[PDB]
RNA sequence: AAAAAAAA
């Protein structure tokens, strides 16, 4: 009898980034209402031997799961990259692995503040524009010239501590 | 590929090409728009005239010199005026 | 399905290009070479541990976990495997996946003498029509959207 | 950056030893340095400070080792003993770096006392700890839990306590024993052969066996098969009464039941917990075990006893009620004694040597237990 | 580039700067703008857009077409606040 | 009593 497996795409990250990601998610779930509605699952809520934590993000009627992983031997020689992250988009029994940048883009469709439709019209009438975008990781593609110009003339907000980003969590630093 | 700027007589064309393309290829590119034979023209870079036989590598210009966000600028002439763009 | 194939062929893909890429087994980096080969081969035989393969020049890695760890087994219209028979000194890896909404097969081979090899990605035509159409459409609609100038002030 | 002492409120806030505390974001390291030989006052003693989320170079452990490497040069033909009292146990990176540091330096011994264990459930931290401490081919580093005496020493020598006596908080002994069991589990501590031989003898007439030992292992159900959870395995003993510890001493069974809830077992799965005891449970411990088993329907209990502990006849009632709750009670035979020797003892490769009359005593005890569980 | 602008299939649309400069850019690149796409005759004259604004919008055409499909390591697109409002006006007019 | 821990 042949063996069976599940195959994942795991981004190799260092434990410090995972700690910060956890801290930011918790801070914006509880202290700020910005990430309110997200769910955090502790390591002891998962039977998986390697799962370290899960973050579930409702996206309308679908769901985005960010999973962190423990005890992967793949860790680097210096153990720069012992741990790992994976991203999934689930709806009912359908699932798909998701790119980190597309993950941030999908997140920004639902949660944080962005320029409103009247932002352009207000800007050319010389008025003040509000709300203004505060999540620049959600605009990682090549956007319209309108968005680039507007973001140029009015600067985005810089939340402290920074809003949680899947792109920043899983960005290649060891190899650069 | 890279993108190029050619400005002369308040006239300009925006086009892309390859790295090792010789200046003859650039003149062929501008021919289809200017209806003027290639070898007659001579390009200009940094107010320096360009001879008929010239190559990117020989010229020293590289891909990092010409970007979609900041393409290399060179002038053109017929048988030169580096006219600046408008200002706010 | 035509949209999926067009995406696969024409889209900057996921950061994991379909072109052949050199991959290596990363496990037990520290231990000596012979120990690494022995442990890797034993894991490939048993099916009880996990095995990871990293693209040499990037951050992406493919992880095979035992299907038991996941808990409830997942229905598999297509078959993944880690074969050790087609060649004396090579292991062949086949892994179906769904990436960014398009179904693909990742195929690789590792040489146990050197513990490295080559992997590539191809389009999967069989399961695309078997997967739920509503979920495909929902994800497609979601990814086509932009946050900008969307909210009604 | 060092301070001579800390204020009373700082000490009480940071060295509180509840295993799971939030909002303790600073690490305090009280250190003493002495020279090997007859007891004498420390050559140097101070306190380092750090934040858990700061840069690794700014962690108190790294700062101590940087200071020590330079200060160590004044007399290199000197061999030193170093003692740490630290509120949080070092992190994974610090553990690895200290392992390297101690490998570099042969003439230095390090003993660490910790109020709490930081991230004790992380497999990578557990591996790093085993590398630092358990490995006898590695550095000579000891790690222990702070008890009453250590807390009192810190209050006396590292706190601004103006003629004020140390006052323990409520559950100091309870938390200490929980953390001691957890650390022994992580470090895979083993029983020495003499203790096993003296305590697990099944001769009916025993003299001087006043303490009860208990070796535990856990199994999980999957695919109609019992798979060992190698993490959950260890041994423990009863706590003798102490004025600073438990006034009336705690029985091993109660400590075991206390530690079980910290494992965070999944209520939707099935587990089997196997215990090997030198004495069978007393009446009160049997009642407590029966109540636990009744409440936690997802756990099955198996007890293998070397002897039957009887007193006043309530012990038989206790065994009967514990059995009726759903536990399985048996008598250790050759197989179980050998398994315990090979699993929980530091045998150093030596084989299990049975003593005189083992099998006859096992048979007599099995008959007695059958009579007890059948007669009511 | 043998494609003849004068012909129906031009390969190049002519853009006239209100200031007095004229550029020319491929039909595909102009297709990324709604207004010019709807209009396109092979010549376009803009009433208001200055020369430098036209240059920046055309450079944006080039940039987006180059990186429309790439989603990896997209480079920055420089902008300056003194030109941001007029560039935004041009973009709103062109529906870029 | 709770804190799985940069939720300060
Ligand atoms: Zn936004
Ligand atoms: Zn540390
Ligand atoms: Zn008892």
Author numbering:
A (entry chain B): 1 to 176
B (entry chain D): 2 to 80, 88 to 96
C (entry chain C): 5 to 157
D (entry chain A): 7 to 382
E (entry chain E): 7 to 46, 57 to 112
Paper excerpt:
The crystal structure of VCBC and the AlphaFold2-predicted model of human A3G could be readily fit into a 2.7 Å-resolution map of the A3G–VCBC monomer. Unexpectedly, well-resolved density was observed for a single-stranded RNA (ssRNA) molecule sandwiched between A3G and Vif, most probably originating from the insect cells in which A3G–VCBC was co-expressed. Four nucleotides (named NT1–4) of ssRNA are wedged deeply between A3G and Vif, with RNA forming a sharp turn mediated by a hydrogen bond between ribose 2′ hydroxyl of NT2 and the phosphate backbone of NT4. The A3G CDA1 and CDA2 domains sandwich the RNA tetranucleotide at the interface formed by Vif helix 1 (residues 15–30), strand 2 (residues 39–41) and a 310 helix (residues 42–46). The bases of NT1–3 are bound to A3G, with aliphatic interactions, aromatic base stacking and hydrogen bonds to NT1 and NT2 typical of sequence-specific interactions. In contrast to sequence-specific interactions with purine NT1 and NT2 with A3G, NT3 and NT4 are stabilized by aromatic stacking interactions with Y59 of A3G and Y30 of Vif, respectively. Buried phosphates of NT2 and NT3 are stabilized by hydrogen bonds and salt bridges with Vif (residues Y40, K22 and K26) and A3G (Y124 and Y125), respectively. The arms race interface is comprised exclusively of protein interactions between A3G and Vif and is adjacent to the RNA interface. Residues D128 and D130 of A3G are buried deep in the arms race interface, forming a network of hydrogen bonds with R15 and Q83 of Vif, respectively. Furthermore, W70 of Vif interacts closely with W127, D128 and P129 through hydrophobic interactions.
